[PDB]
Design a protein around this nucleic acid. Structure first.
Lengths: 333, 197
RNA sequence: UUCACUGGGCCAGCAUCAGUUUUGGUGGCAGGAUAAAUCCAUAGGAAUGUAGCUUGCCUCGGUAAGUAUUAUAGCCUGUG
RNA sequence: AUGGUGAAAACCAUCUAGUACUGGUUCCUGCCGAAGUUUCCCUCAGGAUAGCAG
RNA sequence: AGAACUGGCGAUGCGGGAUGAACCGAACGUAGAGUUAAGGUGCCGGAAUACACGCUCAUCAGACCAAAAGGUGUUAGUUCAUCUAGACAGCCGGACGGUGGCCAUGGAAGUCGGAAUCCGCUAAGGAGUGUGUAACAACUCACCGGCCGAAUGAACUA
RNA sequence: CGUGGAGGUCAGUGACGAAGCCUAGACCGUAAGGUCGGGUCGAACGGCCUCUAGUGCAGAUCUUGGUGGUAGUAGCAGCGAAACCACAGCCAAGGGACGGGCUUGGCAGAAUCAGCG
RNA sequence: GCAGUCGCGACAUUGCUAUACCGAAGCAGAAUUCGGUAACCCUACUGAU
RNA sequence: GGCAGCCGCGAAGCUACCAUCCGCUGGAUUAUGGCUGAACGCCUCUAAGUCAGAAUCCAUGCUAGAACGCGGUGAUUUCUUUGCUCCACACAAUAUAGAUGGAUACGAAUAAGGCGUCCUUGUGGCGUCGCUGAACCAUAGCAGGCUAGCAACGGUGCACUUGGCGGAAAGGCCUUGGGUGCUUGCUGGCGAAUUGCAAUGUCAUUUUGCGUGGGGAUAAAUCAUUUGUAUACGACUUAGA
């Protein structure tokens, strides 16, 4: 294979980490640089092709897409990074103090025996008049103008057996880092939804860890230039509907995804097959460089979403279809 | 003469500075080099780049990974040049190498202490007027020194309020000199003048 | 048989000594063209021409070019 | 070679410690100490002979 | 490749040469003090980053034989010349009449070509060194005339 | 210098301990070796003037016997080898002929299992 | 190669025997050509404690 | 077909030009074409400078991440018999790539620079400095003692005390107010000896442990099972007061 992807050693951790962040402007408002999710299988999509000058312009096309469950992500702290002649150094980290049992379990390898004393004395600095947090924030304001916010996922909401949350650093693109830290102050302990950052048809890149094949595979990999197709939310009725079919059904196929739970919460649908297997954690960065190609600028209008069963070979699309076709059965009567 | 000697690399010659620092290390004098990125090397920039590349491609034919490592930082380049003038692999050489520290710019607390220079290793004194010369910082940034901007930025930041510190010191020295001058002409001052003080 | 003194063992200093040897200070001698220089005196010579004189001339009487071998500078040669 | 053994590639005891070219050649100290070649028997075989060193 | 003589090796330690039996010195009892050979005095490396006169930017110089020659690289010498009757160069002006010489010929008039290279005037002009027009036309370098100022150009050695 | 035996001597040493051996103990000498300090040992041993030799080991793909890594491996939880072994395993350069321990450089991170490339 | 024209005789001299980027060629366009940037084993190998 | 298979289908693995999604942008450049330009009173892309630009180089991105490079953060053992952590007090060991006053702080250039003064506030006018640091504080008291006054009320050590500055390796500084030693700035009252003519003649710091006192916290990791998103053994990844 290509020497750039060597050596073939196993990935450092299953949770891949972003190694680069989008360029920041000192005038634009605050905006998150990346998000995280869990690959909850894949599906098939059919959509119109309005691309001009194409051999199949105005026609319909079919493709495969990957669904990633992206529940609300809750902030837990903010970190400042100072530039030096020896790279970036973590000058200061200040936490929300509202650390959940999930992050406590993440910090404790054998939680079932741990006394669960993590973050007890430090809570005093926040559960009073304090002003130590204010002093640290002023220190950050005066000092380095690059800030990263620590967040974790609501793993309990996600239908997974891991039950352990994961920490992730996200950069902010807002100028006047005083404003960045002020926004962090008001958003401390808060949860951000998917639709806040990304938008439909936006071009992004994804990073994950590939499935192991026996060493074979099991390495961190990044796939760039992926177009976001949909951003569905649990509170959004009929997340799997479209303008044409407008069927009041969820993206969850008949019997749910194979080797994964029946997703009924926030999720993102993007072009291509993002690396990583089912239940694998992946991260999504927002196009470090503002590509102006027609491929990125074009929009997509979803026509219909495949929802037939994946285990085996799908016989119908929705449960209402099978029983309607059958009419009656001994299993029923 | 001094427990630690701070040497400013700006305007100096790499070879002469390395030789003198190695000699001082072998003699037991602790030396710390500052402003390495501002060091200069005789010869044209193109010639310096060619002579760096011909050595970089000479790393090793048998195993590139096990061959030498091309340190791009000017401080590491100066350290390698000095090590080339020291009997490394020996206990005495290893002990001497611990007495040398090289940092880009003037990191603290060295910034608050006096910095000396070596007259016999200055470009202004060793190079003929009008002759081309190469900048160590430019050479490093050409070969992959990605910290040049930050170095200049924080050096300028230091010089900001270094000017203020100098202004305060100058005012204090002027006041002291005026106080001494108005105290002159006294019997003690005249007696000291006779003895040379 | 009490303790002390002495000869006796390990390391050096002080003063002067004999051999080898390194590096300073200072004095008296014979030779050079009886060193040459430098200095004093005398006749000339010259300009990279000092005083003074003449013709343009801007900066008020300011400067260039001619003259002038010493005058309100000095130099060289020959000689004692 | 002599004397015996068994048998559908021989063996056993003596002459035989039988015929040069490899290999090996054991304590210390002091003094001296070279040579690598002349001569014809022509030489290919081998000594003789002369010099150095006692 | 062959005759032949001298010195090391042989049978040979030591100093320097990154390292090399054949390179230079030096040939050997165990020790101390002092002075040296060859080689060195920026570091590894013990010794001056000594003094004095000049050369070189080499784009892998320099510390180590095919190459005579070229370089609008640099720095010194020899021979010719012209010079305050004006050194080279720079700017402006003349740069002729016969003549459009004869011929190959629709045209080669100075410039597609051949033989000639003719004479007059001068201060000097080639039957023309080139640009170029179908030929003429126009510019022109070399030859001369006016302003600026002084050493310059050529041929060789190194 | 050292050893086996032998001739004369020390009217020699020696159960109150002679040989041999051990001895990170001290002396003698340039040296073969000799002497003494301490532990086991148990019945013989040394200096001096001379004669004698089956008289002194670092190798001989040496002989007799024994012991190491290979190896707790192959093999048939247990039993359990053989071949091989001056001595070990990072490279570039020069060695004007051979570089694996010479020289100049880069560097080397204990120990350890697996697929053969 | 030999010979000859130019005391040793320097060049001339006659006899026989891939793509991409540049300047050009009489490059109208396309295409083409020339000159440049030049394309049961040591060390092991790799996964891993 | 209760024993060993065929027929047709057949997920899930095995696993693909037999399919599926994607596959970077910014500089320094050489070649090359020009600008300003004397050497060579004219020219000239080059010698001083200088514009653009190559499948060239470096950067952005991607993969690994020195297990011997680094920063921040939660928990940090109520029983490892008051155990453990931070300080003050007293004894030892431990050694020191090697104090024997002070590592005494503008920047840029070197065919140029500072310091003082002035107004014309600048590339301004005037004076002066260097020509090395041979430099500046401090340098007297038993290795620095016990005491009395004079003139100043300054200098310095002590814990303190109000604030700011310093994030590059900040871990240090300036001060604001009082108290408490010395003050050799100046003049006095006493011990010094015997170490015998010298033996570094001993005073510094890196850490650790046994003890006393004064503050503080009082939890984790590995194994077993389980688990899978991993498999070649290890490893990796989950759960149960």
């Amino acid at each position: 294979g290509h020497l750039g992807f060597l050596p073939r050693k196993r990935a450092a951790s299953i949770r891949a980490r972003v190694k680069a962040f989008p360029k920041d402007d000192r005038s634009k408002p605050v905006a998150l640089t990346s998000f995280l999710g869990y690959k909850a299988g894949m599906t098939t999509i059919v959509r119109d092709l309005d691309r001009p000058g194409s051999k199949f312009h105005k026609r319909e096309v079919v493709e495969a897409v990957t669904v990633v469950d992206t529940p609300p992500v809750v902030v837990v702290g903010v970190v400042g990074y100072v530039e030096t002649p020896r790279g970036l150094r973590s000058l200061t980290t200040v936490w929300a103090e509202h650390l959940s049992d999930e992050v406590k379990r993440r910090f404790y390898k054998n939680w079932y025996k741990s006394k669960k004393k993590a973050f007890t004395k430090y809570s005093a600095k926040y559960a009073q008049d304090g002003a130590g947090i204010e002093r640290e924030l002023a220190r950050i304001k005066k000092y380095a103008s690059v800030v990263r916010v620590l967040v974790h996922t609501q793993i309990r909401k996600t239908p997974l057996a891991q039950k352990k949350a994961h920490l992730a650093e996200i950069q902010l693109n807002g100028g006047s880092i005083s404003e960045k830290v002020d926004w962090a102050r008001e958003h401390f302990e808060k949860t951000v939804a998917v639709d806040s950052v990304f938008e439909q048809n936006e071009m992004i890149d994804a990073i994950a860890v590939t499935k192991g094949h026996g060493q074979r595979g099991y390495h961190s990999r990044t796939s760039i230039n992926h177009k976001i197709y949909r951003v569905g939310k649990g509170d959004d009725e009929a997340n799997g509907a479209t303008s044409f079919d407008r069927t009041k059904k969820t993206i969850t196929p008949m019997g749910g995804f194979v080797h994964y739970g029946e997703i009924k919460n926030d999720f993102i649908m993007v072009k291509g097959c993002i690396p990583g297997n089912r239940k694998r954690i992946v991260t999504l960065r927002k196009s470090l460089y503002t590509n102006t190609s027609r491929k990125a600028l074009e929009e997509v209008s979803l026509k219909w979403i495949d929802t037939a069963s994946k285990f085996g070979k799908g016989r119908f699309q929705t449960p209402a279809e099978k029983h309607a076709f059958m009419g009656t059965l001994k299993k029923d009567l | 003469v001094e427990p630690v000697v701070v040497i400013d690399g700006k305007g100096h010659l790499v070879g002469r500075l390395a030789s003198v620092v190695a000699k001082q290390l072998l003699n037991g004098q602790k030396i710390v080099v500052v402003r390495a990125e501002e060091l200069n090397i005789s010869g044209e920039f193109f010639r310096n780049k060619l002579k760096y590349h011909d050595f970089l491609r000479k790393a090793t034919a048998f195993n590139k990974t096990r061959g030498p490592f091309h340190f791009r930082a000017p401080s590491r380049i100066f350290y390698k040049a000095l090590r080339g003038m020291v009997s490394h692999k020996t206990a005495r050489g290893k002990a001497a190498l611990e007495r040398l520290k090289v940092f880009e710019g003037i990191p603290p607390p060295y910034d608050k202490k006096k910095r000396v220079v070596v007259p016999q290793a200055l470009r202004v004194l060793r190079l003929k007027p009008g002759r081309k010369y190469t900048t160590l910082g430019k050479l490093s940034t050409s070969v992959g020194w990605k910290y040049e901007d930050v170095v200049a930025k924080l050096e300028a930041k230091r010089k900001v309020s270094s000017a203020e510190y100098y202004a305060k010191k100058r005012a204090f020295t002027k006041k002291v000199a005026s106080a001494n001058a108005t105290a002159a002409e006294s019997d003690v001052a005249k007696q000291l003048a006779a003895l040379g003080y």
